[PDB]
UniProtKB/TrEMBL annotation, chain G:
This is Uncharacterized protein. It comes from Trypanosoma brucei brucei (strain 927/4 GUTat10.1). The lineage of its organism: Eukaryota, Discoba, Euglenozoa, Kinetoplastea, Metakinetoplastina. One of its GO terms (cellular component) is cytoplasm.
UniProtKB/TrEMBL annotation, chain H:
It comes from the Eukaryota. Residues 1-52 form the Small ribosomal subunit protein mS41 SAM domain. Keywords: Mitochondrion. GO terms for cellular component: kinetoplast; mitochondrial small ribosomal subunit; mitochondrion. It is found in: Mitochondrion. The keyword Mitochondrion applies. Belongs to the mitochondrion-specific ribosomal protein mS41 family. This is Small ribosomal subunit protein mS41. Its main location: mitochondrion. Signal peptide: none annotated. The lineage of its organism: Eukaryota, Discoba, Euglenozoa, Kinetoplastea, Metakinetoplastina. The chain holds residues 64 to 187 of 187 of the full protein. The keyword S-adenosyl-L-methionine does not apply.
Automatic annotation (TrEMBL), chain I:
This is Uncharacterized protein. It comes from Trypanosoma brucei brucei (strain 927/4 GUTat10.1). The chain holds residues 10 to 98 of 440 of the full protein. It comes from the Eukaryota.
From TrEMBL, chain K:
Acetyl-CoA binds at E57. It comes from Trypanosoma brucei brucei (strain 927/4 GUTat10.1). This is Uncharacterized protein. The chain holds residues 109 to 537 of 966 of the full protein.
Length: 212, 203, 108, 50, 86, 170, 162, 124, 89, 226, 413
RNA sequence: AAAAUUUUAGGAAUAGUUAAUAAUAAUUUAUAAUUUUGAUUAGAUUGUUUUGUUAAUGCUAUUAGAUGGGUGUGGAAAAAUAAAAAAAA
């Protein structure tokens, strides 16, 4: 049940093309015009071009150009977080990329959240680090993730990470972060530079004095 | 390897219990050793204190025969065969035993049977293996007959000349076509043998 | 080298061939020296890839511990030199008649 | 089997070839290397009967 | 190893394969059908004048009456006979 | 397979016949005993032609020692301490089979050789690639393990039932 | 209709898809027989001609060098120092793919393979005005043994000879 | 019943019991009104069960029905797709590549507007 | 033909075949039993092969020896007759 | 050949086996070399029924109108992780959650430890690509105590179904080199209390009584009845 | 009819682009003559074509190349004062005039030589052209502009071609260089100007071409070309030493496989060059190579380069002798087109072990031959290897001249 | 790879051509090669002591086959369809 003798030998082990019956009759002149008009339909070429005879997919130099020439779906970034998403896709989503992201790079995306739309862009970068890039998080990753969701006032997603953290990738969650979101404690951190309990609505009850 | 074999056999025969370490360090990974090394070393395996050390050393020797492409000889397998009540190490495959039982029972039943001990000419021998028969069956004819125009037949035909009349020949063809070729249609005399096999068949 | 005396495996210095005969005579030649001194007219490229350093695992465990693996590429880019730095002593027993008994880093 | 070393000499004579001295030397050395000495003497008798 | 495989007679390891002893038949009716024990290739050579390697004999699958019963009566001599040359 | 011989010649003619002398040449080696190093002698035997020079004898020692410990540096041939001129023939020194020849090495150098000539090179230009041994050491006839015995599988004229003629004309 | 069959094959041989798509679009509108079904959309509708690009490049400066570059509409150009390094990347990759020969072509395009031409007089036909360059009819038009029986001569001396 | 052209399960009414199924030869299968491939499959299954092989085989009907829908000439379990006359979008009437409306897709969604309103209420 | 039983590993795949060739350990064990029962027959087969080979070689040896003796006598008489005819010519 | 089944025996074509030699039968197809393969149809096809009621998003769709609620994004991440784990555990999914990328630890397939089969792979190096579920893994193969001398490529390293048990003593940092585990015959001395061989050459496992009962009921020897 | 016939039909020849058009049309004419596919074309004297030309069916096989060469001659008589005008700002540069002269010389060396009785013209038109004035005009236009010769490889091939044009057409090579580099000298030869202005070659083949032009540029003056030493061993002229050291450069002869593409004919040129360098400077070599240490950093570099070149030349001779037609004795073209690599690059490899066009690509590369020593090669190499030694050495005990003589006798028998 | 053997009621010229060759992949040399002892082309055209007849070395018949551009895959293109040649339990 092999296609060794039904198609040319350069289509050996070939899967995932649109239709491999196209590339056996390309050299016919009515199909040769159709291939060159399709390369003009795809853009990126200043001269008439046909793909090589022993290639079914586009060449590696040509698909690299069309991926770089393709305009991003997000035009006119307003927030500096949305500029960081465009820097994330130029660096960690380039054509045939090799370098993986860093847990410190995820902390930079989680530190630029201003509006609740930014949390949808930031948490989808957190999903690419766990599922797509498969990166083990740092020890303080849940700390930056918790204070990111409190800037936008979204607590119901922060407690959503506590009921199942090992699918999300938070291998270290300290107990004072667990007691805050579950309702045992009413603060989640102590400031080393200000000596007050965060958030500031609880600091008016707990610490009535300001200490260095 | 034959230089290390005498050293291994000397350390086995002296009972020093260090021939296996010498075989591991010097002969195992860096030599094309035959199986008879272990035929010494199993005796060094035999003199161990506990039976489980003997068993594990024998099984490790079998894994060494598997890994380094040195197959176990018949003498080593018969050495491990004699201590099967103590070690219980299987030294024959699952295929050879099923062949051996069905062969040995059949050969014993065939040797005890008095009917099937008779010789069978279809089974015992080959009567003739040469490409040509040993005596003349009369054929070929080397002549034509009535209605045959093609003589000699050329490719794959033993006819050499026409049956009755021919164009004039010279030399050895003149002696051949008239006297010396085969003729099985002769009612008096068969086609004659070469000398001296014609004098004793004159009558 | 730890079990029999090999003749030219250990020298006192790098072999001084002329610069014109450098590409012709040097490839295929091996020698051991004492200390980490590298030849001149070479660019030092240290092998830090764990995919490339894993093949010295048996060399670093059962024999001398591999400290550094360096690739030396010259100015004309035509003569490599694979420099491996070992740290003594050997885990193998060294014969007194062997070549590595004439080495200070191997005997100490 | 080593008997083929005696066989390919005999088929050399059935096919009307004259076996040279190298064929007899190779047959006797091949049959002596396998421990068949009577077959080597039969090769010698074949050489004498030719 | 063809593009469109011969669907009715597939074989193994290409042509011409190992020599095989077969019992080939004729394109006749069953009442005159006989078999030839032959040695041929795995794929039948249809482009040659040599279509077989060696002819071992002929087997007749129809039983014949024993025409040699009064010669010397032995046990089970009057049964039918299956003639074959080997 | 062009071996410059397209017929059968069972004899050996004059261009392959060489007149050889079995010259044995000594090397000063050192062996390890329980005390220390002891100086001994290692002999390398070659078949040198009678018309050869001493440089050719040195090259024959280099190509036929097949030992990684003997020809390691630049050595010099000598007889009774007196060194030999490598541009002189063996007949000019009267060197025979009983002549004791020594090889004095200079171990500070390093012998860089180029073995571009095969070990079995005669005038007929027939050399093996997997030769691995001088032709004086190898046996004349041995069993061939690389080939395979093949029988006749194509019958010529006889194929079957009755041998009438056998198609011996074919 | 014979002229459009030749001229379409010449433009696809000389790497002209714009001139070939405009020829099939023209023959479908004029009612040429055999081309009323072949009508292609004009993908070069917004693009200028290739000749007017070249004299514009000798003489908006960011759009001057990249006027020949074709974009889908959902594509944007790079910076001009980055795009010009990418434009010479493609022109060295096109010439690398066009220099390697196809091994069983005898140095010919696929239009020229099996393209033997003789006029209509070579196969049992005579002059007609509407057949300007008429390729000779195939040998399957007249079979032997349907015009004359076996061992009988047929009046076609040079038919099957190409 | 594993084959499409061997409908073995269509002849359950052609036998009375187990012994009648296992004692009938091919001539008795022929006179009962069974086609040739079906009675050959029945006799082969009976002779395989007599030799110790129960009918444990995979039903190859749906797999062959999947492989039938392609244009393999020899039914050799390959996949050969059909190529239509128009396989590119430019020749099917579509002029150029569709451009996305970048002002429509870059508007803030309704949940984002509701959360911005909630943030503006809770911050003040 | 390789048998595909119903209790093999099913390939839940709509783009190919519905049953793989991955067995059960019971199927592995019974296949080993059938392998041994074939191994007995093929052992006897190879034994009779080698026996018939050496039988054919021994028969060729004996018949070739007899043919060589008779053919040497025949060729000696033929060469003597040819020498006499050459002398007369 | 190099390794035929039962020597040369050709009474049937099944007597040769399903493959005539462990080497590739043609020189032009090196992928036809005989090796242990893995049922990738059942393993690579993960259960898509855990993604129902879950709105996944494309990578390229970074426009503002296509974004989802952060609770919906988090449940999409949880559903995608449970989709990737749903069949089995990968090598690259087990080693990323380990110290020093799991270097020195022992990875094993499920069927590598049952029956009389004993084989594992001591990991030495893993080079992750951008899609962190794939890549290439290297390790020393240990089969019944004997170990390779060099690290070999772990075949089917991306197909799920792998297992490991983390041991802190086996963890090798990125500064050092992963040492090869010792051969129990050669390197360390043989001890029956430490490691005992489950199988050896010329050894076959005894017949289980349930398989004997099943085969004798299938062949008709035992009276199987409803 | 050539296209140049429509360019000389009465136009204004002083126009610059018309001169450029005439030049490129003549270049294309000479190049299509040189690269003409001459597979089926045969020129045998046929009696039936006496009072006519060749027949209409054999025009392309008999008449085409002769008419092409006669058209080249009749256009060269009309064009050679337009492309290369006489020496009294120019319309054509020196490079394009050099390219036109090179294709004209390539058409002149491969002229039609066989004169049939059918030919009505003179037989002297079937002889090669004399291009001396054109070489002098190109040399004047090349010494007019600076940096005409560069250290690039294409300029190395241009240097080789210009030295070839000066050797063949009796023109001094000193006209190609400015006169201040030749001033202070009464007379210089072609070979001395080659050895004084040679660039350092990056391949062995360019050095072989330079070493061939050195020997052929001075036949009887080969002594005065490469003598840089006195009769006592002291170096006389260091310019020839610096030229000969940068001829046998390390980028050309440095690797052990540097002579892997050297045929049997080029190895004779290498050994003849080494033998001439040893013979002209014997008092230098027999003093310095044995037991002499020198303080000059140039002399040790020259000695190391000469020893390396002699050793790799003898190794290549032993390669071609002891392994005839071996796969390690095969040659190939420099920058040779191996189409299997370009076929693997411009294809999609899903399995990289499956190489497409393997049965054809593994057989075919740009010119690749099995090399063995012929009669004319072995008889010359047996002389040159004996020339490499000294006069006091015994030629009987040399084990390479004896092997070459026995190879000659064995292959002749 | 070689030898060898076809026919035309109104009988004449033929050629990607012959040999040499340091020449794969022919820039050269030659007084080149086939043919009136019947060539090339055109017509007819698988051949085959297997058929039929007769006193007939006469006359008369034939159905084994092969297939330089469909895919450089495969050991070999013979590959777009064949009641078996049973095709790896
Ligand atoms: Mg000539």
């Amino acid at each position: 049940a092999s296609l060794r003798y039904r198609r040319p030998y350069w289509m050996m082990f070939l899967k995932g093309v649109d239709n491999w019956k196209i590339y056996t009759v390309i050299q016919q002149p009515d199909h040769q015009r159709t291939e060159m008009l399709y390369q003009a339909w795809l853009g990126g070429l200043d001269r008439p071009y046909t793909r090589p005879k022993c290639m079914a997919n586009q060449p590696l130099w040509l698909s690299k150009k069309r991926h770089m020439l393709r305009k991003e779906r997000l035009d006119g970034p307003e927030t500096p977080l949305e500029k960081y998403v465009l820097e994330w896709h130029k660096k960690f989503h380039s054509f045939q990329g090799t370098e993986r992201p860093t847990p410190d790079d995820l902390h930079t995306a989680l530190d630029l959240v201003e509006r609740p739309l930014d949390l949808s862009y930031a948490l989808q970068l957190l999903g690419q680090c766990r599922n797509l890039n498969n990166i083990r998080f740092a020890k303080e990753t849940f700390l930056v993730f918790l204070e990111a969701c409190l800037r936008v006032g979204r607590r119901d997603c922060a407690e959503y990470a506590l009921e199942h953290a090992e699918p999300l990738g938070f291998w270290f969650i300290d107990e004072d972060h667990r007691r805050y979101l579950q309702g045992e404690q009413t603060w989640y951190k102590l400031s080393p530079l200000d000596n007050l309990y965060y958030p500031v609505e609880e600091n008016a009850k707990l610490n009535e004095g300001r200490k260095p | 390897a034959d230089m290390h074999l005498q050293v291994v056999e000397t350390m086995v025969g002296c009972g020093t219990m260090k021939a296996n370490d010498y075989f591991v360090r010097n002969v195992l990974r860096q030599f094309s050793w035959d199986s008879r090394f272990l035929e010494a070393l199993y005796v060094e395996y035999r003199r161990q204190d506990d039976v489980d050390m003997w068993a594990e050393l024998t099984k490790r020797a079998l894994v060494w025969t598997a890994r380094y492409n040195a197959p176990a000889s018949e003498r080593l397998r018969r050495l491990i065969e004699d201590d099967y009540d103590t070690i219980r190490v299987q030294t024959r495959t699952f295929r050879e035993l099923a062949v051996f039982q069905f062969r040995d029972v059949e050969e014993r039943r065939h040797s005890r049977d008095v009917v099937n001990e008779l010789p069978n000419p279809w089974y015992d021998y080959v009567a003739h293996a040469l490409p040509f028969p040993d005596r003349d069956a009369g054929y070929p004819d080397e002549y034509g007959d009535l209605g045959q125009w093609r003589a000699p037949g050329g490719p794959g035909s033993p006819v050499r000349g026409p049956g009755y009349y021919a164009p004039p020949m010279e030399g050895e063809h003149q002696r051949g076509y008239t006297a010396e070729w085969r003729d099985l249609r002769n009612p008096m005399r068969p086609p004659e043998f070469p000398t001296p096999w014609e004098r004793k068949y004159r009558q | 080298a730890a079990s029999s005396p090999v003749p030219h495996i250990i020298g006192s210095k790098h072999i001084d061939v002329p610069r014109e005969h450098r590409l012709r005579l040097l490839p295929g030649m091996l020698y051991l020296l004492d200390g980490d001194t590298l030849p001149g007219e070479f660019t030092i490229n240290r092998v830090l890839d764990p995919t490339a350093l894993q093949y010295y695992g048996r060399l670093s465990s059962q024999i001398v511990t591999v400290e550094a693996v360096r690739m030396l590429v010259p100015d004309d880019l035509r003569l490599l030199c694979n420099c491996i730095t070992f740290k003594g002593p050997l885990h193998l027993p060294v014969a007194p008649y062997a070549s590595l008994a004439s080495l200070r880093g191997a005997s100490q | 089997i080593p008997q083929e070393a005696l066989h390919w000499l005999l088929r050399m004579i059935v096919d009307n070839f004259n076996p040279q001295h190298v064929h007899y030397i190779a047959a006797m050395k091949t049959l002596q290397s396998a421990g068949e000495l009577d077959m080597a003497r039969d090769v010698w008798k074949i050489m004498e009967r030719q | 190893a063809r593009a469109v495989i011969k669907r009715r007679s597939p074989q193994l390891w290409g042509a011409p394969g190992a020599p095989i002893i077969r019992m080939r038949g004729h394109h006749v009716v069953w009442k005159f059908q006989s078999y030839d024990l032959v040695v041929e290739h795995t794929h039948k050579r249809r482009n040659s004048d040599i279509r077989l390697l060696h002819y071992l004999g002929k087997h007749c699958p129809h039983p014949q009456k024993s025409l040699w019963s009064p010669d010397t009566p032995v046990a089970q001599d009057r049964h039918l006979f299956m003639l074959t040359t080997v | 397979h062009d071996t410059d011989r397209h017929y059968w010649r069972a004899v050996t003619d004059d261009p392959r016949v060489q007149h050889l002398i079995p010259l044995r040449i000594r090397f000063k080696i050192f062996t390890w005993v329980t005390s220390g190093w002891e100086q001994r002698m290692q002999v390398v035997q070659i078949m040198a032609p009678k018309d050869s020079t001493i440089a050719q004898v040195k090259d024959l020692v280099i190509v036929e020692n097949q030992s990684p410990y003997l020809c390691v540096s630049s050595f010099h041939l000598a007889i009774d301490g007196k060194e030999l001129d490598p541009q002189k023939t063996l007949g000019e020194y009267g060197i025979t089979e009983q002549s004791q020849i020594d090889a004095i090495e200079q171990n500070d150098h390093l012998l860089h050789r180029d073995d571009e000539r095969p070990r079995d090179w005669t005038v007929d230009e027939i050399t093996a690639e997997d030769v691995k041994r001088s032709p004086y050491k190898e046996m004349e006839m041995q069993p061939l393990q690389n080939l395979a015995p093949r029988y006749e599988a194509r019958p010529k004229g006889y194929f079957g039932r009755t041998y009438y003629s056998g198609m011996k004309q074919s | 209709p014979t002229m459009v069959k030749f001229y379409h094959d010449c433009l696809v041989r000389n790497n002209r898809p714009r001139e070939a798509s405009s020829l099939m679009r023209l023959a479908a509108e004029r009612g040429v027989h055999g081309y009323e079904d072949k009508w292609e959309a004009d993908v070069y509708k917004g693009r200028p001609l290739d000749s007017e690009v070249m004299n514009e490049s000798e003489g908006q400066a960011s759009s001057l060098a990249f006027a020949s570059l074709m974009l889908r509409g959902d594509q944007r150009p790079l910076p001009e120092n980055l795009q010009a390094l990418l434009e010479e990347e493609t022109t060295r990759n096109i010439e690398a793919e066009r220099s390697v020969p196809v091994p069983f072509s005898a140095g010919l395009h696929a239009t020229e393979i099996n393209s033997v031409f003789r006029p209509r007089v070579y196969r049992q036909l005579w002059y007609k005005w509407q057949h300007i360059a008429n390729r000779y009819r195939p040998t399957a038009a007249l079979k032997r043994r349907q015009l004359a029986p076996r061992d009988s001569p047929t009046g076609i001396p040079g038919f099957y000879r190409i | 019943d594993i084959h499409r052209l061997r409908p073995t399960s269509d002849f359950k009414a052609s036998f009375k019991d187990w012994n009648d199924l296992f004692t009938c030869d091919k001539r008795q299968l022929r006179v009962r009104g069974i086609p040739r491939m079906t009675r050959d499959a029945i006799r082969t299954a009976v002779q395989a069960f007599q030799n110790g092989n129960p009918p444990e085989r995979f039903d190859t009907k749906e797999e062959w029905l999947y492989y039938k829908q392609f244009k393999t000439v020899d039914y050799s379990y390959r996949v050969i797709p059909e190529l239509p006359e128009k396989y590119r979008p430019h020749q099917s009437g579509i002029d150029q590549a569709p451009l996305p409306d970048y002002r429509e897709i870059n508007k803030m969604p309704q949940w984002a507007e509701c959360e911005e309103r909630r943030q503006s209420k809770k911050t003040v | 033909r390789q048998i595909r039983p119903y209790y093999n590993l099913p390939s839940k795949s709509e783009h190919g075949r519905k049953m793989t060739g991955f067995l059960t350990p019971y199927r592995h064990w019974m296949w080993k039993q059938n392998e041994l029962w074939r191994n007995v027959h093929e052992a006897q087969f190879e034994h009779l092969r080698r026996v018939y080979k050496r039988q054919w070689l021994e028969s060729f040896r004996v018949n070739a020896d007899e043919y060589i003796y008779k053919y040497n006598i025949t060729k000696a008489a033929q060469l003597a007759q040819w020498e006499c005819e050459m002398k007369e010519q | 050949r190099a390794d035929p089944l039962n020597g040369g025996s050709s009474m049937t074509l099944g007597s040769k086996g399903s493959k005539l030699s462990p080497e590739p039968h043609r020189r032009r197809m090196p992928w036809t070399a005989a090796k242990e393969y893995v049922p990738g149809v059942v393993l690579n096809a993960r259960d898509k029924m855990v993604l129902d009621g879950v709105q996944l998003l494309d990578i390229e769709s970074i426009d503002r109108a296509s974004q989802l609620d952060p609770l919906e994004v988090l449940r999409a991440v949880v559903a995608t992780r449970e989709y990737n784990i749903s069949t089995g555990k990968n090598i690259f999914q087990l080693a990323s959650q380990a110290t020093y990328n799991g270097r020195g630890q022992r990875f094993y397939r499920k069927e590598w430890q049952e029956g009389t089969y004993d084989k594992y792979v001591t990991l030495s190096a893993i080079d992750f690509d951008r899609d962190g579920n794939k890549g290439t893994a290297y390790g020393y193969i240990t089969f019944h105590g004997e170990t390779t001398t060099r690290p070999v490529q772990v075949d089917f390293a991306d197909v799920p179904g792998w297992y490991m048990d983390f041991v802190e003593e086996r963890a090798v940092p990125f500064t050092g080199i992963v040492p090869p585990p010792p051969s129990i015959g050669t390197d360390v001395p043989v001890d029956p209390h430490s490691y005992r061989l489950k199988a050896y050459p010329y050894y076959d496992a005894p017949n289980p009584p349930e398989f004997v009962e099943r085969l004798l009921k299938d062949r008709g020897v035992l009276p199987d009845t409803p | 009819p050539s296209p140049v016939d429509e360019c000389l039909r009465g136009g204004s020849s002083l126009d610059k682009r018309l001169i450029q058009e005439v030049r490129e049309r003549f270049v294309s004419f000479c190049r299509e003559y040189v690269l003409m596919d001459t597979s089926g074309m045969k020129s045998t004297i046929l009696s039936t074509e006496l009072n006519a030309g060749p027949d209409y069916e054999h025009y392309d096989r008999r008449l085409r190349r002769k008419r092409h060469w006669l058209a080249i001659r009749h256009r060269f008589e009309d064009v050679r004062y337009v492309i290369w005008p006489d020496v009294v700002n120019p319309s054509l540069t020196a490079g394009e005039m050099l390219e036109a002269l090179l294709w004209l010389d390539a058409a002149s060396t491969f002229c039609v030589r066989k004169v049939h009785p059918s030919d009505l013209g003179d037989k002297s038109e079937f002889l090669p052209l004399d291009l001396q004035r054109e070489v002098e005009v190109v040399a004047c236009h090349a010494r007019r502009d600076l940096d005409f010769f560069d250290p690039s490889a294409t300029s190395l091939e241009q240097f080789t071609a210009c030295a070839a044009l000066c050797v063949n057409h009796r023109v001094p090579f000193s006209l190609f260089f400015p006169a201040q580099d030749v001033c202070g000298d009464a007379s210089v030869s072609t070979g001395q100007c080659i050895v004084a202005n040679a660039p350092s070659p990056h391949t062995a083949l360019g050095a072989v071409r330079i070493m061939a032009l050195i020997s052929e540029g001075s036949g009887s003056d080969i002594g005065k070309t490469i003598m840089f030493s006195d009769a006592f061993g002291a170096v006389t002229r260091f310019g020839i030493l610096r030229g000969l050291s940068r001829v046998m450069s390390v980028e050309a002869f440095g690797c052990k496989d540097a002579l892997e593409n050297v045929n049997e004919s080029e190895l004779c040129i290498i050994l003849h060059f080494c033998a001439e360098v040893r013979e002209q400077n014997a008092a230098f070599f027999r003093r310095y190579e044995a037991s002499e240490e020198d303080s000059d950093p140039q002399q040790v570099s020259f000695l190391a380069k000469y020893q390396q070149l002699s050793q790799i030349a003898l190794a290549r001779c032993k390669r071609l002798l002891y392994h005839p037609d071996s796969p390690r004795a095969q040659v190939m073209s420099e920058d040779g087109y191996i189409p299997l690599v370009e076929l693997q690059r411009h294809a999609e490899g899903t399995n990289k072990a499956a190489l497409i066009h393997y049965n054809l690509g593994i057989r075919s590369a740009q010119g690749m031959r099995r090399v063995a020593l012929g009669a004319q090669s072995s008889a010359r190499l047996a002389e040159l290897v004996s020339r490499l030694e000294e006069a006091s050495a015994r030629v009987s005990g040399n084990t390479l001249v004896n092997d070459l003589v026995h190879h000659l006798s064995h292959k002749a028998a």
